[PDB]
Amino acid sequence: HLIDVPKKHHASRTESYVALPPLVSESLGFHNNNTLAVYQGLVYYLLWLH
Amino acid sequence: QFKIIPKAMSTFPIPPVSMVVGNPGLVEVKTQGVFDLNENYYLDIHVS
Amino acid sequence: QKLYNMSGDYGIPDLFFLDKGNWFTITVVLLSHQDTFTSSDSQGPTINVDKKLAIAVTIADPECLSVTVTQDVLLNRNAVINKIKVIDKKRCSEQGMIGRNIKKTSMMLKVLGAPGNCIQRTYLGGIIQGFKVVPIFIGCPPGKRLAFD
Amino acid sequence: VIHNKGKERTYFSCSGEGILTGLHTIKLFLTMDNLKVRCFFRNENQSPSKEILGLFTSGGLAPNMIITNSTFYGGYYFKLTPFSNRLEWLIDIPRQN
Amino acid sequence: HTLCRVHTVRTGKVFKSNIQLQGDPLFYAFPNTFVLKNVCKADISVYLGQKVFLTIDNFESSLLPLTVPKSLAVGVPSITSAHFVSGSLVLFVISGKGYSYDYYENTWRKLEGISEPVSHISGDVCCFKGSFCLELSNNLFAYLRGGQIPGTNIYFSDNGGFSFQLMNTDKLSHLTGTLGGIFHLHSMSQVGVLMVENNLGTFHYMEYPLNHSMGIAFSYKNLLEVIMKPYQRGFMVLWNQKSILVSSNSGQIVEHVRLIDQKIFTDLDVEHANINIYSVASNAYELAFLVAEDHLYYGSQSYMGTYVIKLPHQPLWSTHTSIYFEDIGILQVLTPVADPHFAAYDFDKCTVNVQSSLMDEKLALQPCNVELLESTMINTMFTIDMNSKLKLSALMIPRKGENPTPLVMVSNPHALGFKANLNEFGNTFDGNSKYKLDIELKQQHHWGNSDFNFTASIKRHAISSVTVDIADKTLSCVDLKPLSTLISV
Amino acid sequence: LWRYYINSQDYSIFSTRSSIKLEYEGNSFVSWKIPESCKVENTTSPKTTLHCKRAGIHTIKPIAGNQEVERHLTVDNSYICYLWYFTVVDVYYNLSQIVTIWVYDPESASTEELIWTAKKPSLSSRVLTKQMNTLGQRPFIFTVEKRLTYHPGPLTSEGTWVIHLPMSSDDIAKVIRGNKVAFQDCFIANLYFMLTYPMTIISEPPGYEPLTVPPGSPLMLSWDTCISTFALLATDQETFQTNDSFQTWTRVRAPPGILSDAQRHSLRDVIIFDQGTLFLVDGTVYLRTEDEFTKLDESRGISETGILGFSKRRWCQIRYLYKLASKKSILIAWSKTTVYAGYATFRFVTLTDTAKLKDFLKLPQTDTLEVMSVEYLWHPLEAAVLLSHCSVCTTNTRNIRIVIYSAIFQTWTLQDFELQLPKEAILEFRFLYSAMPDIIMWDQHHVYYSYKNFTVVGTISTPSGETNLSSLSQGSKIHQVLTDRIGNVVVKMENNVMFYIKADITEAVILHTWVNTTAKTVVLFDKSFEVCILYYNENLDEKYQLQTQPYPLILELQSINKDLGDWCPYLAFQHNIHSQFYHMDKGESLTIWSQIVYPENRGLYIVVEHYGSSVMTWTQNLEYEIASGFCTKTMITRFFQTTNYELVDNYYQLQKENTGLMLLQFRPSEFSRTCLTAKPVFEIDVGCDSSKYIMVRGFNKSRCQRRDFSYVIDKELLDNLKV
Amino acid sequence: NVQILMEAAPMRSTGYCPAEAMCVLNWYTPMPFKNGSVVSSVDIYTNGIGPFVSKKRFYVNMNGFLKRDASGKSLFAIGYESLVLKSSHFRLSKSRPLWYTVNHAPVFILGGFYDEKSILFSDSNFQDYVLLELSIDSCWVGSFYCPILGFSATIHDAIATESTLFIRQNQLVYYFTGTYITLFDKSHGSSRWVRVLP
Ligand SMILES: *[C@@H]1O[C@H](CO)[C@@H](O[C@@H]2O[C@H](CO)[C@@H](O[C@@H]3O[C@H](CO[C@@H]4O[C@H](CO[C@@H]5O[C@H](CO)[C@@H](O)[C@H](O)[C@@H]5O)[C@@H](O)[C@H](O[C@@H]5O[C@H](CO)[C@@H](O)[C@H](O)[C@@H]5O)[C@@H]4O)[C@@H](O)[C@H](O[C@@H]4O[C@H](CO)[C@@H](O)[C@H](O)[C@@H]4O)[C@@H]3O)[C@H](O)[C@H]2NC(C)=O)[C@H](O)[C@H]1NC(C)=O
Ligand SMILES: *[C@@H]1O[C@H](CO)[C@@H](O[C@@H]2O[C@H](CO)[C@@H](O[C@@H]3O[C@H](CO)[C@@H](O)[C@H](O)[C@@H]3O)[C@H](O)[C@H]2NC(C)=O)[C@H](O)[C@H]1NC(C)=O
Ligand SMILES: *[C@@H]1O[C@H](CO)[C@@H](O[C@@H]2O[C@H](CO)[C@@H](O[C@@H]3O[C@H](CO)[C@@H](O)[C@H](O)[C@@H]3O)[C@H](O)[C@H]2NC(C)=O)[C@H](O)[C@H]1NC(C)=O
Ligand SMILES: *[C@@H]1O[C@H](CO)[C@@H](O[C@@H]2O[C@H](CO)[C@@H](O[C@@H]3O[C@H](CO)[C@@H](O)[C@H](O)[C@@H]3O)[C@H](O)[C@H]2NC(C)=O)[C@H](O)[C@H]1NC(C)=O
Ligand SMILES: *[C@@H]1O[C@H](CO)[C@@H](O[C@@H]2O[C@H](CO)[C@@H](O)[C@H](O)[C@H]2NC(C)=O)[C@H](O)[C@H]1NC(C)=O
Ligand SMILES: *[C@@H]1O[C@H](CO)[C@@H](O)[C@H](O)[C@H]1NC(C)=O
Ligand SMILES: *[C@@H]1O[C@H](CO)[C@@H](O)[C@H](O)[C@H]1NC(C)=O
């Protein structure tokens, strides 16, 4: 057993971000090309701000 | 939150509880599943 | 959002960064055979456990990295719990900035006789244990930025 | 709460004395009156005994009753009463409870 | 070979030392032999038999017999009852009159309070450090066994045992037949008497909790000798030549004894088994008796009943032997041997390791079902005031396969109410899981889960004992003692 | 008759990678019989080598014309292979020492390193040392009595670590340890050693004459009580003294005209100190130093031609002896009617005569009461004397008693002995390593024992039960008896046959034949506490007249145990006692931790035994656990005092009443052979050591140099003072 | 070192779709890539619900040899795709190693065929083996100082690194550079291969 190690992302010196697709109110819950373009723009803004 | 305890040889890589949703269109389900030292499985689900 | 503190991977950390006297520890726990020791092992005030199940650490570039290890035995649970503490020796790796002063150095942790023979056989295959190499980079890492209050 | 921890024995035998059913299970029926149930500790001797009840009621131990629905949980406590006369534990619950 | 290997202890006979006794010796008034042990000063002990020996050591060296110095006319020096009061004093009943003996000194004192001849001295000794139960260990009863309650006189003392005063007979007016003893049942914080109306007998309680109340009657062939367990948990052992009973309660229920043989239990009747028990040794949790036909029986006394097994054979009975619990899991057979060349007695001892003893394949006992039971409440004693609650904790780790059922109980439920939660946290490196149980204790009335017939007042102080135990613990669990503590409201 | 040797003294190294040299001596020899797992080189030779990789026990027997016994040897897999080698040098100007350390493998080392005569590491040792520096292994030295560590510098051109070390003479015991870096699945064992000032053996002037034992008598040997490998040995032809384990020796002789030729061949006993040597020549005491050979007389407080014996301490209580700050007796002599306590500088007063002891023991006077042997027990400030009592004589039977004398209290006590022995038998007694006096004594035909506070008193007997050792050794008398810290007692015969005893064990073990009947041999100790046999024979080239060979007593005992069938009742016993002397003041307590691990329910516990004038209280907390079919019992005990000195009278009197020293020992409940555990015995003293005091900051004795001062202060006192 | 965690999205692929609502369906995910790196390790793993699916790692990093013609379709600046993966090519050949930097190589190159001047250049870890025919002439040096006597158009020792790519035909080292913007500049975008070290 290996225990009490530091958790990886704060000791191996990495930087993390999250980006989740927006909630779509469609009954099927499927996206479209338009909303994925919106998602791509949002993840671009996240990377830019990073 | 649930705890799962094996009594025999346990599947370490594959989690042993598969969860299924009857209607995914009205509910949002976020799941976390972690392992213990003796393969005790801690799972927790948030439903909205 | 940007992930400060979360619930990431378990297991061994991949690599390491160090800067001027900081350190880290790994605590290892071994469970031995049911009858790994006999009454003939009672030879001194403390049980000698190195003859059967011992843990060793080897360092490279030894004049810049120090390692201190210490065991403890609980024979009721057939366990040996040990702490390995690795510290910087405050020399080498000349003064620099951000991405220059770093020198790479791989330390090895192992338990004697384990490598090759033992294996954790799980569902879907088996993984090799008893011998793990961790790399550290001495110098100074990214992330440490200075600002004006 | 370990679900498959292992249950193999029925330590209690309870009855409401209104409708008798199979002694292997405890089925109770609720009507307008107070639900009145007499219960005893079933052991190797299946008859009620004043010895085991007196042993239990000496350490401040009294039975407890958990009723559950799909959305409801409730607990009811058997009263601590001296064992000088009784043989089985008794409890009566108002319907509005 | 098995069980014990004998060992003889004798000192003081190195050279020609002229040591002689002076006075009339002391002898017991019963065929059986006994060893009375002090509670916490366990080194001091009294062996009562054909000769009486008071040892300050744990029966080491050579001991001269106890002697009356003839300065006071004791008549026939027969001892009927002995007791250990707090301090360096021991009380004896010689020829119906009470006497005090100091063993650090050589002081004899005559008890002047008693007038009518008594036969037995009774009392309870708590020796927790402090000043609380030092006063509790001062109330003592003096009574004559086998007498008629209408007419006989019974004395008590609250100043230890200095002066004895007869109590009024108004309280005992309505009890008819023969008394078997009066006890300060501090587990109930009550006063109880044993009463023999007929061939069967019962128990009576004085104080307002269960006043004028009764226990389940039990047979009373011949007389009985009554032995308390020294932890104030109310465990009672009543033995004589041809019977033995165990009261798990404080006399409310007195039941028989089980016997384990080939994984089946049977009730043990001494007369029907055609045996005669010779010696009885009682620990805080354990019990053992030597049957005069060279037999030894050991039992663990607990709730739900007592299981008694027969130890392997060894010729131990030698007309003078006495068993006593040297320690938990350690029995000791002691036999004094005379020596007229130096006019002194040496001793022969067998140290019986019962834990090592109960592994014979002919017995085949199932091992312990619990791996660890540890708490920190056994060291001290706890007090409660009103509108105040307290909490205690314990940790238990069970065996790999079995499923033991723990249970916590209170000696006196009338003035002590509990709520215990047992939650699982963590697990050991093997895989066995630690369980932590915490109990919350307060007064019984504040819970509100008792009748007015059961609450029994709130304005008066009382005393009880809290015990955590395993309900389905098997035998061979000698060292894993259940946890017990003393708590005064 | 055959035997075997191994390359290393330390038996922890012994594993499958080692080699065993098998040597058979005898006219008739055929071959060797081995199991299939192990291999012998040149199986038809009486001298050969044995290599074996599979672990377990192996039965080896040399098949020959006569009957040769077989031997079972245990080989176990070990991860400790390498060993430390160190070489010291002493400088006096700085009053320090310098040590050079390197790593050597016993299987592939040089010959000189195997006998501790090397000054430069060999090629394999140097390459392995630089490999250990490369992988990163660094030794360091740790003093035992006071926990101080000393570190080396960098490796030199050759493989050598150089460490400087203060000259202490109070903490003479040290260890050397290393990091946990291993090479190729092999470790390096820690090494224990002792060092103090280098002492000088005497030189020989020309024209001197040897001092010998009487002809036909056995050869004697005596060593220093604290540091071994410094001893003096007397034979029928010469007296030798060694600064080492008799690797190099120097003769000891006498100036002409001091003693007669007949007197020079009547030397009875010898004792060695750092200052000089003491000879008992025909009942007269002679002191030999590097300067003179002076005969002790009445001017120093001794009698002439009346001394029958003398003795010294046997356990190195050097810390307490140094910290006592009071010079005490270092020797005790007895003259059958009077004992003398010899202090330093070899002058003394009479201790006790027999008349005072006769008055003490309430004897009816005019009785034959004699003193015959005095020993220093483990407690530093008392002694014990064997008293022989006639009991109105007219028979051959004499009562044997013991009397103890306490120097701190200047009192006497009589203990419980009931031994009856004839007039002819002479007695020699020793104290075992215990807080409680346990006595092993022998009378050149039997060995009797007193254990467990003089209660278990009896005769050590054979498993057959003869109780006489001469019959099992063809009618010969007891020569040497050696004890140790562990508790194994070794009885050597003049036939050179072997008996083994364990402390608190009645049955003895006859060892297998290892050494010839006619060989002139002695048993001694190496730098460690292992058994060595020294062979002396004249008519040689002066370089092999004294040859030392180690003895595998543990392996022979193991073979005997596989023959018999015994086992240790407990798996393990641990304790936290890391010292022998513990000193604390009023406001501190002492905490001791211990633990036993044993089978499922064989009910055991830890026995704590005490000795002295008890002034302390104990608190004990016990924990019990069962796991994997094994029981673990953990004990934590605390020793403390609970007295108050506020608002009391006779404060100094109470302070003296609540002071002294205590002896404690820890042991299992029941134990037998094959239990190699060391019983922890220690001492606890209360009071001040007179080495702790109080300084104001900024002040010092002589950092500020100044001169003499004089002044007058008047009219301000509580008339004219000149100070 | 930076990492981005995203959840995929559901996408009804457009077509005739005779069914009403559920149809051909494929998860889609955005694709960011920052300035200053080429090596992108993508990790795909299940949400936690649904059928079990394993965890995988892929590398779609920075294929940067790509030029656009007038018609607007992909073209390799090193060579042209003109051959067929015939099983005959390496049915008896030995095993040939694969050389690149320790982790930072955004491409992979492997040749060592029988006689054909072809490599197996591919992104990822040869998950998608796209063959290539190099537009490099087949040259052989001359004499005296030199000898190498057998062209054998089989790029031996085909190595690469970030940006540059090195091949060795018979005594001829040729060096190429892919265009890799946001790493250094537009500058060393090679027109084609160069015989270097004259
Ligand atoms: C009862 O048992 C007793 C115990 O054995 C018997 O005592 C024995 O008596 C013998 C004679 O009475 C002694 O034998 C003599 O030993 C001399 C020692 O010389 C040196 O010996 C060492 C080691 O000796 C052997 O080595 C082998 C090596 O494999 C071992 O296996 C073996 O066990 C034994 O130990 C040699 O190594 C020496 O050689 C060199 O030594 C140098 C160190 O100085 C070293 O640097 C170098 O590299 C060499 O190794 C020596 O040889 C022998 O010398 C004697 O031989 C004689 O020597 C002289 C002078 O050299 C010659 O002039 C002469 O011709 C003859 O060769 C002789 O062999 C034996 O030592 C002794 N046992 C012990 C333990 O001391 C007793 O006799 C028995 N009684 C009965 C009745 O049986
Ligand atoms: C006490 O005095 C002695 C006197 O000999 C000291 O020993 C000497 O120590 C010095 C300082 O280290 C040595 O000088 C140099 O040492 C280095 C060590 O790396 C060496 O590389 C150099 O070549 C040079 O020798 C000196 O050699 C040494 N003396 C001898 C004879 O070796 C000792 O250090 C003093 N101890 C203390 C605590 O002051
Ligand atoms: C080990 O055995 C010896 C030998 O018996 C023990 O010494 C004994 O100690 C006791 C108690 O100190 C002595 O008793 C004394 O009795 C007189 C009256 O007879 C009393 O006045 C004294 O105050 C004291 O109590 C006893 O004489 C003494 N025996 C001898 C021979 O001196 C010792 O205590 C034992 N050790 C242990 C740890 O048990
Ligand atoms: C490599 O790093 C450069 C420098 O950050 C990145 O180029 C810059 O990207 C930002 C956002 O993508 C551009 O900002 C945009 O500018 C236009 C025109 O002014 C404006 O309409 C937008 O609203 C937005 O603000 C910026 O102009 C651009 N700078 C240059 C010199 O091109 C580049 O994106 C990085 N490489 C990659 C692959 O991301
Ligand atoms: C103590 O008082 C309680 C009061 O509830 C007694 O309970 C009786 O129970 C029986 C049967 O349930 C009822 O018929 C009675 O009416 C109850 N008594 C009252 C006063 O209501 C209980 O029996 C009493 N116990 C003792 C020993 O006196
Ligand atoms: C029923 O509810 C009432 C009102 O709270 C309560 O007083 C009574 O005790 C309850 N009955 C039981 C059996 O708990
Ligand atoms: C005694 O008990 C009776 C009923 O059993 C009760 O009425 C009375 O109050 C009690 N008296 C005391 C003093 O407890």
PDB file of N, CA and C in Angstrom, chain E residues 266-295:
ATOM      1  N   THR E 266     -26.403 -28.431  29.912  1.00  0.00           N
ATOM      2  CA  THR E 266     -27.398 -29.051  30.776  1.00  0.00           C
ATOM      3  C   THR E 266     -27.387 -28.375  32.137  1.00  0.00           C
ATOM      4  N   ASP E 267     -28.532 -28.387  32.814  1.00  0.00           N
ATOM      5  CA  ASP E 267     -28.587 -27.844  34.164  1.00  0.00           C
ATOM      6  C   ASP E 267     -27.797 -28.734  35.114  1.00  0.00           C
ATOM      7  N   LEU E 268     -27.077 -28.108  36.042  1.00  0.00           N
ATOM      8  CA  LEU E 268     -26.222 -28.818  36.985  1.00  0.00           C
ATOM      9  C   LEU E 268     -26.873 -28.787  38.361  1.00  0.00           C
ATOM     10  N   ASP E 269     -27.286 -29.954  38.842  1.00  0.00           N
ATOM     11  CA  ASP E 269     -27.735 -30.128  40.215  1.00  0.00           C
ATOM     12  C   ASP E 269     -26.685 -30.937  40.961  1.00  0.00           C
ATOM     13  N   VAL E 270     -26.171 -30.369  42.054  1.00  0.00           N
ATOM     14  CA  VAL E 270     -25.062 -30.988  42.776  1.00  0.00           C
ATOM     15  C   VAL E 270     -25.492 -32.312  43.400  1.00  0.00           C
ATOM     16  N   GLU E 271     -26.664 -32.331  44.041  1.00  0.00           N
ATOM     17  CA  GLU E 271     -27.141 -33.546  44.694  1.00  0.00           C
ATOM     18  C   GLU E 271     -27.422 -34.654  43.686  1.00  0.00           C
ATOM     19  N   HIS E 272     -28.057 -34.318  42.562  1.00  0.00           N
ATOM     20  CA  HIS E 272     -28.340 -35.313  41.536  1.00  0.00           C
ATOM     21  C   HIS E 272     -27.088 -35.771  40.802  1.00  0.00           C
ATOM     22  N   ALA E 273     -26.075 -34.916  40.699  1.00  0.00           N
ATOM     23  CA  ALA E 273     -24.780 -35.308  40.163  1.00  0.00           C
ATOM     24  C   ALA E 273     -23.945 -36.080  41.173  1.00  0.00           C
ATOM     25  N   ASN E 274     -24.368 -36.100  42.442  1.00  0.00           N
ATOM     26  CA  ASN E 274     -23.727 -36.880  43.505  1.00  0.00           C
ATOM     27  C   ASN E 274     -22.275 -36.451  43.706  1.00  0.00           C
ATOM     28  N   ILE E 275     -22.075 -35.139  43.805  1.00  0.00           N
ATOM     29  CA  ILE E 275     -20.770 -34.554  44.064  1.00  0.00           C
ATOM     30  C   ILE E 275     -20.897 -33.642  45.274  1.00  0.00           C
ATOM     31  N   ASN E 276     -19.747 -33.237  45.805  1.00  0.00           N
ATOM     32  CA  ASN E 276     -19.684 -32.289  46.907  1.00  0.00           C
ATOM     33  C   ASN E 276     -18.609 -31.260  46.600  1.00  0.00           C
ATOM     34  N   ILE E 277     -19.009 -30.003  46.484  1.00  0.00           N
ATOM     35  CA  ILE E 277     -18.064 -28.925  46.223  1.00  0.00           C
ATOM     36  C   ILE E 277     -17.320 -28.606  47.512  1.00  0.00           C
ATOM     37  N   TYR E 278     -16.003 -28.465  47.405  1.00  0.00           N
ATOM     38  CA  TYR E 278     -15.153 -28.232  48.565  1.00  0.00           C
ATOM     39  C   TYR E 278     -14.716 -26.786  48.717  1.00  0.00           C
ATOM     40  N   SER E 279     -14.278 -26.136  47.641  1.00  0.00           N
ATOM     41  CA  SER E 279     -13.812 -24.760  47.739  1.00  0.00           C
ATOM     42  C   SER E 279     -14.438 -23.927  46.630  1.00  0.00           C
ATOM     43  N   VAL E 280     -14.598 -22.632  46.893  1.00  0.00           N
ATOM     44  CA  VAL E 280     -15.183 -21.695  45.940  1.00  0.00           C
ATOM     45  C   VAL E 280     -14.311 -20.448  45.883  1.00  0.00           C
ATOM     46  N   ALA E 281     -13.896 -20.067  44.676  1.00  0.00           N
ATOM     47  CA  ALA E 281     -13.144 -18.844  44.439  1.00  0.00           C
ATOM     48  C   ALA E 281     -13.909 -17.964  43.459  1.00  0.00           C
ATOM     49  N   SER E 282     -14.025 -16.679  43.790  1.00  0.00           N
ATOM     50  CA  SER E 282     -14.809 -15.744  42.990  1.00  0.00           C
ATOM     51  C   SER E 282     -13.954 -14.538  42.636  1.00  0.00           C
ATOM     52  N   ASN E 283     -13.828 -14.263  41.341  1.00  0.00           N
ATOM     53  CA  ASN E 283     -13.180 -13.054  40.859  1.00  0.00           C
ATOM     54  C   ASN E 283     -14.243 -11.979  40.636  1.00  0.00           C
ATOM     55  N   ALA E 284     -13.858 -10.869  40.003  1.00  0.00           N
ATOM     56  CA  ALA E 284     -14.844  -9.861  39.628  1.00  0.00           C
ATOM     57  C   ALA E 284     -15.786 -10.387  38.552  1.00  0.00           C
ATOM     58  N   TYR E 285     -15.259 -11.165  37.604  1.00  0.00           N
ATOM     59  CA  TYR E 285     -16.049 -11.711  36.512  1.00  0.00           C
ATOM     60  C   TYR E 285     -16.116 -13.229  36.488  1.00  0.00           C
ATOM     61  N   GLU E 286     -15.174 -13.923  37.115  1.00  0.00           N
ATOM     62  CA  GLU E 286     -15.027 -15.363  36.966  1.00  0.00           C
ATOM     63  C   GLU E 286     -15.463 -16.082  38.236  1.00  0.00           C
ATOM     64  N   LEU E 287     -15.596 -17.403  38.125  1.00  0.00           N
ATOM     65  CA  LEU E 287     -15.951 -18.233  39.263  1.00  0.00           C
ATOM     66  C   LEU E 287     -15.316 -19.602  39.069  1.00  0.00           C
ATOM     67  N   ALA E 288     -14.898 -20.217  40.171  1.00  0.00           N
ATOM     68  CA  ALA E 288     -14.361 -21.566  40.105  1.00  0.00           C
ATOM     69  C   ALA E 288     -14.701 -22.289  41.397  1.00  0.00           C
ATOM     70  N   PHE E 289     -14.873 -23.604  41.300  1.00  0.00           N
ATOM     71  CA  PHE E 289     -15.075 -24.397  42.501  1.00  0.00           C
ATOM     72  C   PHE E 289     -14.376 -25.744  42.388  1.00  0.00           C
ATOM     73  N   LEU E 290     -13.781 -26.147  43.505  1.00  0.00           N
ATOM     74  CA  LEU E 290     -13.116 -27.429  43.656  1.00  0.00           C
ATOM     75  C   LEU E 290     -14.065 -28.402  44.341  1.00  0.00           C
ATOM     76  N   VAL E 291     -14.357 -29.498  43.648  1.00  0.00           N
ATOM     77  CA  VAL E 291     -15.150 -30.611  44.152  1.00  0.00           C
ATOM     78  C   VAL E 291     -14.202 -31.594  44.823  1.00  0.00           C
ATOM     79  N   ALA E 292     -14.576 -32.032  46.033  1.00  0.00           N
ATOM     80  CA  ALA E 292     -13.678 -32.772  46.915  1.00  0.00           C
ATOM     81  C   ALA E 292     -13.202 -34.093  46.324  1.00  0.00           C
ATOM     82  N   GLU E 293     -13.892 -34.627  45.319  1.00  0.00           N
ATOM     83  CA  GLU E 293     -13.407 -35.817  44.618  1.00  0.00           C
ATOM     84  C   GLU E 293     -12.397 -35.453  43.532  1.00  0.00           C
ATOM     85  N   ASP E 294     -11.416 -34.627  43.910  1.00  0.00           N
ATOM     86  CA  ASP E 294     -10.308 -34.201  43.050  1.00  0.00           C
ATOM     87  C   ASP E 294     -10.796 -33.667  41.705  1.00  0.00           C
ATOM     88  N   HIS E 295     -11.744 -32.734  41.753  1.00  0.00           N
ATOM     89  CA  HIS E 295     -12.290 -32.166  40.530  1.00  0.00           C
ATOM     90  C   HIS E 295     -12.258 -30.648  40.597  1.00  0.00           C
TER      91      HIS E 295
END
